[PDB]
Amino acid sequence: QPASPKALEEAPWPPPEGAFVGFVLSRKEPMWADLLALAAARGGRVHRAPEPYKALRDLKEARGLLAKDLSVLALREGLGLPPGDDPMLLAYLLDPSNTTPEGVARRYGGEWTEEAGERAALSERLFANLWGRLEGEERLLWLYREVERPLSAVLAHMEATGVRLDVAYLRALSLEVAEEIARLEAEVFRLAGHPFNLNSRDQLERVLFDELGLPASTSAAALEALREAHPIVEKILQYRELTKLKSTYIDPLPDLIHPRTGRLHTRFNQTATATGRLSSSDPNLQSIPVRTPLGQRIRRAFIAEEGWLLVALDYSQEGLRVLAHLSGDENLIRVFQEGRDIHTETASWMFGVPREAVNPLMRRAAKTINFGVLYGMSAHRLSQKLAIPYEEAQAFIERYFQSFPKVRAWIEKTLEEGRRRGYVETLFGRRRYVPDLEARVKSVRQAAERRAFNMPVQGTAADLMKLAMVKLFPRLEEMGARMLLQVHDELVLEAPKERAEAVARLAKEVMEGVYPLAVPLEVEVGIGEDWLSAKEAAAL
C-alpha cells in the first residue's frame, strides 16, 4: 500500500492578507451563477468560508485563477472586490496557447479540480511558478502590471454592468428574418418538388444526390462545392446562413437579459485568443455580421439606459497605421502624417496619377490591398475580390510594393526572424510561437506565414486598445460613465445624456494619445440611443 499524499493544512476563515482565492460556481457564467464554495490559501494552508457570499466581504481583492469572474459575481452582489494577480494572465504572456486553467495546470503543474480549497492552493502554486518563469522578462512584467492586471478590473466592470437591449426591436427583427427563411424554404421545396425537413441530413442527401442527381455528404464544406452546381444549393446555403444568424444572434439575446439587472452581460476574456484581442461570449460580438444589412440591424438592439446615451469609438485604419510604424515605410508614414484620405492617397501613389485623377475604381483597388496586405491576401484572392484577371491583380500588388517598399521588406524580415527565433512579437514584446514556419508541407507553412506576420500587426492593435481601456476607465468612473463593449477596432461607452459630449471628446483624446507611433492614431466617435445609431454618427 502507498503512502498517503500530503494534505492541505486547514485554518479558520478569514485568511491573512495576500491569500490566494479558490471558488466553485454552479455554472461558468458568474453573473448567472451561485457561489457554491470559497476557499483561500497561503503558505500551504487553506481557509474554507462557511457561507461563501458573506466571506467575500473579508477579502480586499480576488487573487487567483479566474479572479475577474469572482469579481463579477462580487459586483453583482453589490460588493466592489477588485481582481488582482491571476496566474492565467502570467501563463498567457508566457505563451498565448495558454488559455484554460486545466491546460495551465497540466503544463505548469498541479491539476484543475472541482474543489475550492484545491483551486486556491493551485492558484498559489501556479502564481509562484509562473512568476519565477517571468523573472528577467522586463517587458512582459511591465505589460502584466500596466495592462493585463488592471484590464481585468475593467473587464469585470464591463461584464457586471452589462448592456440594455431593445426586446421589441429584436422580436420585430426576428420576424423579418423568419419571413426570409420561409421564402427560401418555399423556393427550395419548389425546386425539390416536395417539402422535406431541410435540417435533416438524411432527407437532404436523398434530394440533392438521389433525386436531383448532383455529383456525390451534406456538410457546409460539401454544399459549398455544389453552390453553383444547382440553384437549390445556393438557396439551402442562404437558408442555413439566416437560420444560424437568427438562432445565434437574435433569438437567444432576450433570454440573456438578467432578471435582477434588466441587462445583457456579455462575457469578456483576456486570455482566449491567438493574437491577444479580447474575446466575447453570449454573444460573441466578433461574429455579428459587419457589412450586411442584417448585421447592422442586430446592433440597433443594443440601447442606452433611459436618460443615457451610447458612445461608439473606433480606431481608423488601426492595422495599417501599426504596419506603417513597424515597417518604417517613409511613403506610407507620409500619407498618414499629412492626413489625407488613406485609400485615395494610396491609389495616387500606386497608379502614378495625381490625387485629383483618382477614380472610384482606383480607390477601391487601393482599399482592398490596404486591408489584404495585413493578412497576406494572395494575388488570386485579390483578382477574385476585384473581379479582374490574375495578371492585373499581380500588377497592382507590384505597384503597391513599388510605392511602399519597406512594407515588403518588413514582411520578409518578420518571417525570417520568425524562422530563426521560433516566435514573432508585438510592439510591446508579447511573443507568439510560430513553429510551423519551418513545416515541410507547403500548404501549412504558408498558412503559418500569414498568421506570423499578422501577429505583430493585430497583436499590437490589441495591446494599444487594452492600454487605452486601462487609461480611460478611471477617467470614465470620475465622470459617472460606463465602459460596456469592445470588439474589432471599437469601444462602446454609456454616459448620462448631459455628459455624453464630454465623455466622447475625452475618450477620443485618451485613445488617440495612448502610445506614440510614427503616424498619428485617429479615432472616430459617434453618440446615439443605440449602438447602430452611434456607429452611423461616427461614420458621418
Side-chain angles (χ1 to χ4, degrees), residues 154 157-158 161-163 263 302-305 308-314 465 468-469 472-473 475-477 479-487 490-496 499-511 523-531 534:
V154 177
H157 159 95
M158 289 166 68
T161 301
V163 64
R263 295 171 76 114
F302 292 70
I303 57 165
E305 178 180 337
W308 298 58
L309 288 175
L310 297 189
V311 183
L313 302 111
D314 74 282
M465 174 65 77
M469 289 171 75
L472 179 56
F473 179 65
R475 310 280 76 72
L476 289 184
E477 288 216 303
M479 289 170 93
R482 296 159 176 164
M483 186 175 298
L484 299 191
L485 309 170
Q486 199 285 299
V487 62
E490 132 180 55
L491 191 70
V492 182
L493 317 179
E494 190 184 40
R499 277 129 102 174
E501 183 182 324
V503 166
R505 291 184 187 165
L506 161 89
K508 180 190 196 301
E509 286 172 37
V510 170
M511 287 171 79
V523 167
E524 295 195 315
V525 55
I527 305 178
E529 296 180 353
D530 65 278
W531 184 13

Short mmCIF file of all heavy atoms in Angstrom, two decimals, residues 154 157-158 161-163 263 302-305 308-314 465 468-469 472-473 475-477 479-487 490-496 499-511 523-531 534:
data_model
loop_
_atom_site.label_atom_id
_atom_site.label_comp_id
_atom_site.label_asym_id
_atom_site.label_seq_id
_atom_site.Cartn_x
_atom_site.Cartn_y
_atom_site.Cartn_z
N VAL A 154 -11.21 46.27 -15.40
CA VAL A 154 -12.04 46.92 -16.40
C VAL A 154 -13.05 45.91 -16.96
O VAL A 154 -14.24 46.19 -17.05
CB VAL A 154 -11.18 47.59 -17.49
CG1 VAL A 154 -12.02 48.21 -18.59
CG2 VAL A 154 -10.22 48.61 -16.90
N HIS A 157 -15.97 45.16 -14.61
CA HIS A 157 -16.96 46.22 -14.72
C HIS A 157 -17.83 46.08 -15.97
O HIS A 157 -19.04 46.25 -15.93
CB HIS A 157 -16.26 47.59 -14.67
CG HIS A 157 -17.06 48.72 -15.26
ND1 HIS A 157 -17.86 49.56 -14.51
CD2 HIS A 157 -17.21 49.08 -16.57
CE1 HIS A 157 -18.47 50.42 -15.33
NE2 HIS A 157 -18.08 50.14 -16.62
N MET A 158 -17.21 45.76 -17.12
CA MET A 158 -17.97 45.66 -18.36
C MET A 158 -19.01 44.54 -18.26
O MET A 158 -20.20 44.74 -18.56
CB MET A 158 -17.01 45.42 -19.53
CG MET A 158 -16.16 46.65 -19.86
SD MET A 158 -14.75 46.31 -20.93
CE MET A 158 -15.58 45.89 -22.46
N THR A 161 -21.70 45.23 -15.49
CA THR A 161 -22.58 46.33 -15.84
C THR A 161 -23.60 45.88 -16.89
O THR A 161 -24.80 46.15 -16.77
CB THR A 161 -21.76 47.54 -16.32
OG1 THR A 161 -20.87 47.91 -15.26
CG2 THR A 161 -22.61 48.71 -16.73
N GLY A 162 -23.09 45.20 -17.92
CA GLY A 162 -23.93 44.71 -19.00
C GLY A 162 -24.43 45.83 -19.89
O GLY A 162 -24.01 46.98 -19.75
N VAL A 163 -25.33 45.48 -20.81
CA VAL A 163 -25.91 46.42 -21.74
C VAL A 163 -27.42 46.16 -21.81
O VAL A 163 -27.88 45.01 -21.77
CB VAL A 163 -25.24 46.28 -23.12
CG1 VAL A 163 -25.48 44.91 -23.74
CG2 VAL A 163 -25.65 47.39 -24.08
N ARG A 263 -30.37 43.70 -17.87
CA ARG A 263 -29.35 43.90 -18.89
C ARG A 263 -28.73 42.57 -19.30
O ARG A 263 -28.77 41.59 -18.57
CB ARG A 263 -28.29 44.87 -18.35
CG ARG A 263 -28.86 46.27 -18.11
CD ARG A 263 -27.92 47.20 -17.38
NE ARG A 263 -26.87 47.68 -18.27
CZ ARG A 263 -26.72 48.94 -18.65
NH1 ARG A 263 -27.73 49.79 -18.67
NH2 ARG A 263 -25.52 49.34 -19.05
N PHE A 302 -29.01 47.05 -29.26
CA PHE A 302 -28.21 47.42 -28.09
C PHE A 302 -28.42 48.90 -27.81
O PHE A 302 -28.01 49.73 -28.61
CB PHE A 302 -26.73 47.12 -28.34
CG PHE A 302 -26.36 45.66 -28.45
CD1 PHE A 302 -26.74 44.91 -29.56
CD2 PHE A 302 -25.63 45.04 -27.46
CE1 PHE A 302 -26.41 43.56 -29.65
CE2 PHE A 302 -25.29 43.69 -27.55
CZ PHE A 302 -25.69 42.96 -28.64
N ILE A 303 -29.03 49.24 -26.66
CA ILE A 303 -29.52 50.58 -26.42
C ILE A 303 -29.01 51.07 -25.06
O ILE A 303 -28.53 50.29 -24.25
CB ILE A 303 -31.07 50.62 -26.48
CG1 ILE A 303 -31.71 49.65 -25.48
CG2 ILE A 303 -31.56 50.37 -27.90
CD1 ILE A 303 -33.20 49.90 -25.24
N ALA A 304 -29.15 52.38 -24.83
CA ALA A 304 -28.71 53.00 -23.59
C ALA A 304 -29.85 52.97 -22.56
O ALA A 304 -31.03 53.00 -22.92
CB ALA A 304 -28.28 54.42 -23.87
N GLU A 305 -29.47 52.95 -21.28
CA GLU A 305 -30.41 53.19 -20.19
C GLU A 305 -31.13 54.51 -20.46
O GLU A 305 -30.56 55.42 -21.06
CB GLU A 305 -29.66 53.17 -18.86
CG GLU A 305 -30.53 53.46 -17.65
CD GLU A 305 -29.77 53.45 -16.33
OE1 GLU A 305 -28.69 52.80 -16.27
OE2 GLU A 305 -30.25 54.06 -15.36
N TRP A 308 -29.56 58.07 -20.67
CA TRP A 308 -28.16 57.89 -21.05
C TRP A 308 -28.05 57.77 -22.57
O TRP A 308 -29.05 57.66 -23.27
CB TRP A 308 -27.56 56.64 -20.39
CG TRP A 308 -27.51 56.64 -18.89
CD1 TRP A 308 -28.56 56.77 -18.03
CD2 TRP A 308 -26.35 56.40 -18.08
NE1 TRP A 308 -28.12 56.66 -16.74
CE2 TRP A 308 -26.78 56.42 -16.73
CE3 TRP A 308 -25.00 56.17 -18.35
CZ2 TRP A 308 -25.89 56.26 -15.67
CZ3 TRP A 308 -24.13 56.00 -17.30
CH2 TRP A 308 -24.57 56.04 -15.98
N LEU A 309 -26.81 57.80 -23.06
CA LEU A 309 -26.51 57.65 -24.47
C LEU A 309 -25.30 56.73 -24.61
O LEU A 309 -24.46 56.67 -23.71
CB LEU A 309 -26.22 59.03 -25.09
CG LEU A 309 -27.40 59.98 -25.26
CD1 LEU A 309 -26.95 61.35 -25.77
CD2 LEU A 309 -28.45 59.39 -26.18
N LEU A 310 -25.25 55.99 -25.72
CA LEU A 310 -24.08 55.19 -26.05
C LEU A 310 -23.09 56.07 -26.80
O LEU A 310 -23.50 56.94 -27.57
CB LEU A 310 -24.49 54.00 -26.92
CG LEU A 310 -25.44 52.99 -26.28
CD1 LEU A 310 -25.57 51.77 -27.17
CD2 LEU A 310 -24.97 52.61 -24.89
N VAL A 311 -21.80 55.78 -26.61
CA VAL A 311 -20.72 56.43 -27.34
C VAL A 311 -19.88 55.34 -28.00
O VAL A 311 -19.34 54.46 -27.33
CB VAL A 311 -19.87 57.32 -26.42
CG1 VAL A 311 -18.80 58.07 -27.19
CG2 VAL A 311 -20.72 58.28 -25.62
N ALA A 312 -19.79 55.39 -29.33
CA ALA A 312 -19.05 54.39 -30.08
C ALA A 312 -17.78 55.04 -30.63
O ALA A 312 -17.87 56.03 -31.36
CB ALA A 312 -19.91 53.83 -31.19
N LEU A 313 -16.62 54.50 -30.24
CA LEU A 313 -15.34 55.00 -30.70
C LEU A 313 -14.65 53.88 -31.46
O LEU A 313 -14.76 52.72 -31.06
CB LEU A 313 -14.51 55.42 -29.49
CG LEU A 313 -15.16 56.48 -28.61
CD1 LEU A 313 -15.57 55.91 -27.26
CD2 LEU A 313 -14.24 57.68 -28.45
N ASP A 314 -13.97 54.22 -32.55
CA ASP A 314 -13.20 53.21 -33.26
C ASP A 314 -11.93 53.83 -33.85
O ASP A 314 -11.96 54.97 -34.33
CB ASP A 314 -14.03 52.53 -34.35
CG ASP A 314 -14.26 53.42 -35.56
OD1 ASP A 314 -15.14 54.31 -35.46
OD2 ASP A 314 -13.54 53.23 -36.59
N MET A 465 -5.35 49.01 -27.81
CA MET A 465 -6.72 49.12 -27.34
C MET A 465 -6.81 48.81 -25.84
O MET A 465 -7.53 49.50 -25.11
CB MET A 465 -7.63 48.18 -28.14
CG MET A 465 -9.08 48.12 -27.62
SD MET A 465 -9.98 49.69 -27.78
CE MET A 465 -10.37 49.65 -29.52
N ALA A 468 -5.44 51.62 -23.83
CA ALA A 468 -6.40 52.70 -23.89
C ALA A 468 -7.54 52.50 -22.89
O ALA A 468 -7.96 53.46 -22.22
CB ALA A 468 -6.95 52.87 -25.29
N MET A 469 -8.06 51.27 -22.83
CA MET A 469 -9.13 50.94 -21.92
C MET A 469 -8.67 51.15 -20.47
O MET A 469 -9.41 51.71 -19.67
CB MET A 469 -9.55 49.48 -22.14
CG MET A 469 -10.28 49.25 -23.47
SD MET A 469 -10.53 47.50 -23.84
CE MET A 469 -11.87 47.14 -22.71
N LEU A 472 -8.42 54.84 -19.82
CA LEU A 472 -9.67 55.58 -19.92
C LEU A 472 -10.55 55.31 -18.70
O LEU A 472 -11.23 56.21 -18.18
CB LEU A 472 -10.33 55.16 -21.24
CG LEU A 472 -11.68 55.81 -21.55
CD1 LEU A 472 -11.60 57.33 -21.52
CD2 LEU A 472 -12.17 55.34 -22.91
N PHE A 473 -10.51 54.07 -18.21
CA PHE A 473 -11.53 53.60 -17.29
C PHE A 473 -11.68 54.53 -16.08
O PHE A 473 -12.80 54.93 -15.76
CB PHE A 473 -11.25 52.16 -16.90
CG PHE A 473 -12.26 51.61 -15.93
CD1 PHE A 473 -13.59 51.46 -16.30
CD2 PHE A 473 -11.89 51.28 -14.64
CE1 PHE A 473 -14.52 50.98 -15.41
CE2 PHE A 473 -12.83 50.79 -13.74
CZ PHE A 473 -14.14 50.65 -14.12
N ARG A 475 -10.95 57.64 -15.67
CA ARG A 475 -11.46 58.94 -16.10
C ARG A 475 -12.97 58.84 -16.31
O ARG A 475 -13.70 59.78 -16.01
CB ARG A 475 -10.74 59.45 -17.36
CG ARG A 475 -9.22 59.43 -17.34
CD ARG A 475 -8.55 60.56 -16.59
NE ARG A 475 -8.62 60.40 -15.15
CZ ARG A 475 -7.93 59.51 -14.42
NH1 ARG A 475 -6.93 58.83 -14.94
NH2 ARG A 475 -8.25 59.31 -13.16
N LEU A 476 -13.46 57.70 -16.83
CA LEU A 476 -14.89 57.50 -17.04
C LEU A 476 -15.63 57.40 -15.71
O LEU A 476 -16.71 57.97 -15.55
CB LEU A 476 -15.14 56.20 -17.82
CG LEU A 476 -14.74 56.19 -19.29
CD1 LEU A 476 -15.15 54.86 -19.92
CD2 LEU A 476 -15.34 57.37 -20.04
N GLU A 477 -15.06 56.65 -14.76
CA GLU A 477 -15.67 56.47 -13.45
C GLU A 477 -15.84 57.83 -12.77
O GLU A 477 -16.90 58.10 -12.21
CB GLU A 477 -14.87 55.48 -12.60
CG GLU A 477 -15.01 54.04 -13.06
CD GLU A 477 -15.04 53.02 -11.94
OE1 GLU A 477 -14.07 52.99 -11.14
OE2 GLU A 477 -16.04 52.25 -11.85
N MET A 479 -16.44 60.60 -14.22
CA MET A 479 -17.47 61.36 -14.92
C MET A 479 -18.84 60.70 -14.80
O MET A 479 -19.81 61.17 -15.39
CB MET A 479 -17.11 61.47 -16.40
CG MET A 479 -15.94 62.37 -16.66
SD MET A 479 -15.35 62.27 -18.36
CE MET A 479 -16.29 63.61 -19.07
N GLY A 480 -18.92 59.58 -14.08
CA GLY A 480 -20.17 58.86 -13.90
C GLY A 480 -20.59 58.08 -15.15
O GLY A 480 -21.77 57.81 -15.30
N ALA A 481 -19.63 57.73 -16.02
CA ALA A 481 -19.89 56.98 -17.24
C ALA A 481 -19.41 55.53 -17.09
O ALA A 481 -18.70 55.18 -16.13
CB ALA A 481 -19.23 57.66 -18.42
N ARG A 482 -19.78 54.70 -18.07
CA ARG A 482 -19.55 53.26 -18.05
C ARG A 482 -18.85 52.83 -19.34
O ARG A 482 -19.08 53.42 -20.39
CB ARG A 482 -20.89 52.52 -17.98
CG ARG A 482 -21.70 52.76 -16.72
CD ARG A 482 -23.16 52.43 -16.95
NE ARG A 482 -23.96 52.56 -15.74
CZ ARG A 482 -25.29 52.63 -15.72
NH1 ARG A 482 -25.97 52.49 -16.84
NH2 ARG A 482 -25.93 52.86 -14.59
N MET A 483 -18.04 51.77 -19.25
CA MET A 483 -17.47 51.10 -20.41
C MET A 483 -18.20 49.76 -20.59
O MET A 483 -18.21 48.96 -19.66
CB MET A 483 -15.97 50.89 -20.17
CG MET A 483 -15.22 50.33 -21.36
SD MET A 483 -13.41 50.22 -21.09
CE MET A 483 -12.98 51.94 -20.84
N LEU A 484 -18.83 49.51 -21.75
CA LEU A 484 -19.71 48.35 -21.91
C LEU A 484 -19.16 47.23 -22.80
O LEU A 484 -19.31 46.06 -22.45
CB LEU A 484 -21.05 48.81 -22.47
CG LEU A 484 -21.85 49.81 -21.64
CD1 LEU A 484 -23.25 49.94 -22.22
CD2 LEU A 484 -21.91 49.41 -20.18
N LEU A 485 -18.65 47.57 -23.99
CA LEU A 485 -18.31 46.59 -25.03
C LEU A 485 -17.00 46.96 -25.73
O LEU A 485 -16.71 48.14 -25.95
CB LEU A 485 -19.41 46.53 -26.10
CG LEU A 485 -20.85 46.34 -25.63
CD1 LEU A 485 -21.81 46.55 -26.79
CD2 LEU A 485 -21.06 44.97 -25.00
N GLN A 486 -16.29 45.92 -26.16
CA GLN A 486 -15.14 46.07 -27.05
C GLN A 486 -15.19 44.93 -28.06
O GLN A 486 -15.35 43.78 -27.68
CB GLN A 486 -13.84 46.02 -26.24
CG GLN A 486 -12.62 46.60 -26.96
CD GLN A 486 -12.05 45.74 -28.06
OE1 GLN A 486 -11.60 44.62 -27.82
NE2 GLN A 486 -11.99 46.29 -29.26
N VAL A 487 -14.99 45.28 -29.33
CA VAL A 487 -14.97 44.32 -30.43
C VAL A 487 -14.23 44.98 -31.58
O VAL A 487 -14.30 46.20 -31.73
CB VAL A 487 -16.40 43.88 -30.81
CG1 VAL A 487 -17.25 45.06 -31.30
CG2 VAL A 487 -16.42 42.77 -31.83
N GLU A 490 -13.05 48.81 -31.94
CA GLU A 490 -14.08 49.70 -31.44
C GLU A 490 -14.36 49.47 -29.95
O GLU A 490 -14.15 48.37 -29.41
CB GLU A 490 -15.29 49.54 -32.38
CG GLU A 490 -16.64 49.33 -31.72
CD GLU A 490 -17.81 49.18 -32.69
OE1 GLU A 490 -17.76 48.29 -33.60
OE2 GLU A 490 -18.77 49.97 -32.56
N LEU A 491 -14.82 50.54 -29.30
CA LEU A 491 -15.14 50.55 -27.88
C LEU A 491 -16.46 51.29 -27.70
O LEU A 491 -16.63 52.37 -28.26
CB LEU A 491 -14.00 51.26 -27.14
CG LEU A 491 -14.00 51.17 -25.62
CD1 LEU A 491 -13.67 49.76 -25.13
CD2 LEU A 491 -12.99 52.16 -25.04
N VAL A 492 -17.36 50.73 -26.87
CA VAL A 492 -18.67 51.32 -26.65
C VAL A 492 -18.82 51.68 -25.17
O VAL A 492 -18.67 50.83 -24.31
CB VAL A 492 -19.82 50.40 -27.10
CG1 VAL A 492 -21.17 51.07 -26.90
CG2 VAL A 492 -19.67 49.92 -28.53
N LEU A 493 -19.15 52.97 -24.93
CA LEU A 493 -19.36 53.51 -23.60
C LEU A 493 -20.83 53.90 -23.45
O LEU A 493 -21.53 54.08 -24.44
CB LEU A 493 -18.50 54.77 -23.42
CG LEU A 493 -17.07 54.72 -23.94
CD1 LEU A 493 -16.38 56.05 -23.70
CD2 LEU A 493 -16.28 53.58 -23.31
N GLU A 494 -21.24 54.10 -22.20
CA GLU A 494 -22.57 54.60 -21.87
C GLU A 494 -22.40 55.77 -20.91
O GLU A 494 -21.68 55.65 -19.91
CB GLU A 494 -23.39 53.45 -21.26
CG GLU A 494 -24.87 53.75 -21.09
CD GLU A 494 -25.62 52.63 -20.39
OE1 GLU A 494 -25.06 52.07 -19.42
OE2 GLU A 494 -26.78 52.33 -20.79
N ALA A 495 -23.03 56.91 -21.23
CA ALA A 495 -22.84 58.13 -20.46
C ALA A 495 -24.20 58.79 -20.22
O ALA A 495 -25.04 58.75 -21.11
CB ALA A 495 -21.94 59.08 -21.21
N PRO A 496 -24.41 59.44 -19.05
CA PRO A 496 -25.56 60.32 -18.86
C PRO A 496 -25.60 61.31 -20.01
O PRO A 496 -24.56 61.81 -20.46
CB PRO A 496 -25.29 61.02 -17.51
CG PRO A 496 -24.41 60.04 -16.77
CD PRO A 496 -23.55 59.41 -17.85
N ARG A 499 -23.63 64.41 -20.16
CA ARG A 499 -22.19 64.25 -20.08
C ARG A 499 -21.64 63.53 -21.32
O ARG A 499 -20.42 63.39 -21.45
CB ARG A 499 -21.82 63.51 -18.79
CG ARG A 499 -21.73 64.44 -17.58
CD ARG A 499 -22.53 64.00 -16.37
NE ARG A 499 -21.77 63.38 -15.30
CZ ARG A 499 -22.29 63.05 -14.13
NH1 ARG A 499 -23.59 63.17 -13.93
NH2 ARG A 499 -21.51 62.59 -13.16
N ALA A 500 -22.52 63.14 -22.25
CA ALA A 500 -22.13 62.30 -23.38
C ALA A 500 -21.07 63.00 -24.24
O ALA A 500 -20.12 62.37 -24.69
CB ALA A 500 -23.35 61.96 -24.19
N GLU A 501 -21.24 64.30 -24.47
CA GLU A 501 -20.33 65.04 -25.33
C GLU A 501 -18.92 65.06 -24.72
O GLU A 501 -17.94 64.80 -25.43
CB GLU A 501 -20.89 66.45 -25.54
CG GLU A 501 -20.07 67.31 -26.47
CD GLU A 501 -20.65 68.72 -26.61
OE1 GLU A 501 -21.88 68.85 -26.60
OE2 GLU A 501 -19.87 69.66 -26.77
N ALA A 502 -18.84 65.35 -23.42
CA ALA A 502 -17.58 65.46 -22.72
C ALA A 502 -16.91 64.08 -22.63
O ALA A 502 -15.69 63.97 -22.72
CB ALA A 502 -17.79 66.06 -21.34
N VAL A 503 -17.71 63.02 -22.47
CA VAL A 503 -17.16 61.68 -22.44
C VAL A 503 -16.57 61.31 -23.81
O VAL A 503 -15.47 60.76 -23.88
CB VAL A 503 -18.23 60.66 -21.99
CG1 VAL A 503 -17.82 59.23 -22.26
CG2 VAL A 503 -18.57 60.85 -20.52
N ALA A 504 -17.32 61.60 -24.87
CA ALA A 504 -16.88 61.31 -26.22
C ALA A 504 -15.54 61.97 -26.51
O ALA A 504 -14.63 61.36 -27.09
CB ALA A 504 -17.92 61.77 -27.21
N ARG A 505 -15.43 63.25 -26.16
CA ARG A 505 -14.25 64.03 -26.51
C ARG A 505 -13.06 63.55 -25.68
O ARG A 505 -11.97 63.40 -26.23
CB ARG A 505 -14.59 65.52 -26.44
CG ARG A 505 -15.55 65.92 -27.56
CD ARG A 505 -15.93 67.39 -27.70
NE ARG A 505 -16.96 67.53 -28.72
CZ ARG A 505 -17.72 68.61 -28.90
NH1 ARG A 505 -17.52 69.69 -28.16
NH2 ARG A 505 -18.68 68.62 -29.82
N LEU A 506 -13.28 63.25 -24.40
CA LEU A 506 -12.20 62.76 -23.55
C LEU A 506 -11.74 61.37 -24.01
O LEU A 506 -10.55 61.08 -24.05
CB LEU A 506 -12.66 62.71 -22.08
CG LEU A 506 -11.83 61.80 -21.17
CD1 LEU A 506 -10.66 62.55 -20.57
CD2 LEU A 506 -12.68 61.17 -20.08
N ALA A 507 -12.69 60.48 -24.33
CA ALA A 507 -12.34 59.12 -24.73
C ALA A 507 -11.54 59.14 -26.02
O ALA A 507 -10.60 58.39 -26.18
CB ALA A 507 -13.59 58.27 -24.84
N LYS A 508 -11.93 60.01 -26.96
CA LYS A 508 -11.21 60.16 -28.22
C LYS A 508 -9.76 60.58 -27.97
O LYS A 508 -8.85 60.02 -28.58
CB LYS A 508 -11.95 61.16 -29.10
CG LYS A 508 -11.34 61.46 -30.46
CD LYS A 508 -12.02 62.64 -31.12
CE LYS A 508 -11.76 62.77 -32.60
NZ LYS A 508 -10.32 62.90 -32.91
N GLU A 509 -9.56 61.55 -27.06
CA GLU A 509 -8.25 62.03 -26.66
C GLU A 509 -7.39 60.92 -26.06
O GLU A 509 -6.22 60.77 -26.41
CB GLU A 509 -8.38 63.13 -25.61
CG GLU A 509 -8.85 64.46 -26.16
CD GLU A 509 -9.18 65.51 -25.10
OE1 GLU A 509 -8.46 65.57 -24.07
OE2 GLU A 509 -10.18 66.25 -25.29
N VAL A 510 -7.95 60.17 -25.11
CA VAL A 510 -7.20 59.13 -24.43
C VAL A 510 -6.79 58.06 -25.44
O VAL A 510 -5.67 57.59 -25.39
CB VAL A 510 -7.98 58.52 -23.24
CG1 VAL A 510 -7.30 57.27 -22.69
CG2 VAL A 510 -8.20 59.54 -22.14
N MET A 511 -7.72 57.67 -26.33
CA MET A 511 -7.46 56.60 -27.27
C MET A 511 -6.42 57.02 -28.31
O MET A 511 -5.57 56.22 -28.68
CB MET A 511 -8.75 56.16 -27.97
CG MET A 511 -9.68 55.38 -27.05
SD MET A 511 -11.31 55.08 -27.80
CE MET A 511 -10.90 53.71 -28.87
N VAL A 523 -9.25 58.36 -34.20
CA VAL A 523 -10.43 57.72 -33.66
C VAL A 523 -11.66 58.49 -34.14
O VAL A 523 -11.70 59.71 -34.09
CB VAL A 523 -10.33 57.69 -32.12
CG1 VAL A 523 -11.64 57.32 -31.46
CG2 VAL A 523 -9.22 56.75 -31.69
N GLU A 524 -12.64 57.75 -34.68
CA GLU A 524 -13.94 58.32 -34.98
C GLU A 524 -14.87 58.02 -33.80
O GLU A 524 -14.74 56.99 -33.15
CB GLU A 524 -14.46 57.76 -36.31
CG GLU A 524 -13.62 58.17 -37.50
CD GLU A 524 -14.28 57.94 -38.85
OE1 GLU A 524 -14.87 56.85 -39.06
OE2 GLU A 524 -14.23 58.86 -39.70
N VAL A 525 -15.79 58.94 -33.53
CA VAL A 525 -16.68 58.81 -32.40
C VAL A 525 -18.08 59.25 -32.81
O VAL A 525 -18.24 60.25 -33.50
CB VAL A 525 -16.17 59.60 -31.17
CG1 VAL A 525 -15.92 61.06 -31.49
CG2 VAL A 525 -17.10 59.47 -29.98
N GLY A 526 -19.08 58.49 -32.35
CA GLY A 526 -20.48 58.83 -32.53
C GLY A 526 -21.25 58.62 -31.23
O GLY A 526 -20.84 57.82 -30.36
N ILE A 527 -22.36 59.36 -31.12
CA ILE A 527 -23.24 59.31 -29.97
C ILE A 527 -24.64 58.98 -30.46
O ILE A 527 -25.08 59.55 -31.45
CB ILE A 527 -23.23 60.66 -29.21
CG1 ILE A 527 -21.81 61.09 -28.82
CG2 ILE A 527 -24.17 60.61 -28.02
CD1 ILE A 527 -21.75 62.42 -28.11
N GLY A 528 -25.33 58.07 -29.76
CA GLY A 528 -26.67 57.67 -30.15
C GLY A 528 -27.39 56.91 -29.04
O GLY A 528 -26.77 56.49 -28.07
N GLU A 529 -28.71 56.71 -29.22
CA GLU A 529 -29.52 55.98 -28.25
C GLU A 529 -29.32 54.48 -28.39
O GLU A 529 -29.62 53.72 -27.47
CB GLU A 529 -30.99 56.37 -28.41
CG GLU A 529 -31.24 57.83 -28.10
CD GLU A 529 -32.68 58.31 -28.23
OE1 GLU A 529 -33.53 57.53 -28.71
OE2 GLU A 529 -32.94 59.48 -27.86
N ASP A 530 -28.78 54.06 -29.54
CA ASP A 530 -28.48 52.66 -29.81
C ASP A 530 -27.13 52.56 -30.51
O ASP A 530 -26.63 53.53 -31.08
CB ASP A 530 -29.57 51.99 -30.67
CG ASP A 530 -29.69 52.56 -32.07
OD1 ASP A 530 -30.35 53.61 -32.23
OD2 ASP A 530 -29.07 52.00 -32.99
N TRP A 531 -26.55 51.37 -30.46
CA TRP A 531 -25.21 51.16 -30.98
C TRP A 531 -25.14 51.44 -32.48
O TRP A 531 -24.19 52.09 -32.93
CB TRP A 531 -24.79 49.75 -30.61
CG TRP A 531 -23.40 49.35 -30.97
CD1 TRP A 531 -22.35 50.13 -31.37
CD2 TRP A 531 -22.92 48.00 -30.91
NE1 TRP A 531 -21.25 49.34 -31.59
CE2 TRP A 531 -21.56 48.04 -31.30
CE3 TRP A 531 -23.51 46.78 -30.58
CZ2 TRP A 531 -20.79 46.89 -31.37
CZ3 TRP A 531 -22.74 45.64 -30.65
CH2 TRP A 531 -21.39 45.70 -31.02
N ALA A 534 -25.09 55.15 -33.03
CA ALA A 534 -23.80 55.70 -32.63
C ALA A 534 -22.76 55.47 -33.72
O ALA A 534 -21.98 56.37 -34.06
CB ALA A 534 -23.39 55.12 -31.29
#
